[PDB]
Amino acid sequence: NFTLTQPRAHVDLGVGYTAVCATAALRCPLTDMGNTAQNLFFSRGGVP
Amino acid sequence: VAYTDRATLNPWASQKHSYGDRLYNGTYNLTGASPIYSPCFKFFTPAE
Numbered sequence: 001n002f003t004l005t006q007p008r009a010h011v012d013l014g015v016g017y018t019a020v021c022a023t024a025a026l027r028c029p030l031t032d033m034g035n036t037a038q039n040l041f042f043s044r045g046g047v048p
Numbered sequence: 049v050a051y052t053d054r055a056t057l058n059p060w061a062s063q064k065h066s067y068g069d070r071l072y073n074g075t076y077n078l079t080g081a082s083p084i085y086s087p088c089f090k091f092f093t094p095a096e
Contacts, residue, residue, distance in 0.1 A: 035053050 061092070068092070 012018075051057075061068025070076055072088040079086065 035051075 056062045058068075060066050061072070063069070069092050071078055072086065072092045074080060074089065074093070
């Protein structure tokens with residue numbers, strides 16, 4: 001099992017910002033906006 | 049899995065050995081020897 005590893009490096013050369021993100025489009029929403037409560041009883045906290 | 053707040057909406061044909069799913073599911077041979085096509089053969093049936 002030849003473990004090929006290639007160490008390298010990289011450095012930025014920008015005074016302000018030379019790279020921008022632009023959230024533009026929308027795919028399908030991942031979590032449904034349905035009806036879901038929470039039952040905080042999971043937490044063994046407080047004096048009973 | 050659709051309206052999770054509840055468990056069903058038809059307590060009389062969504063349960064095992066209920067009023068409807070014994071009548072409309074051919075595994076029990078109620079309307080077996082009857083050659084009429086009833087269009088509920090697919091909405092109530094455990095398929096292969």
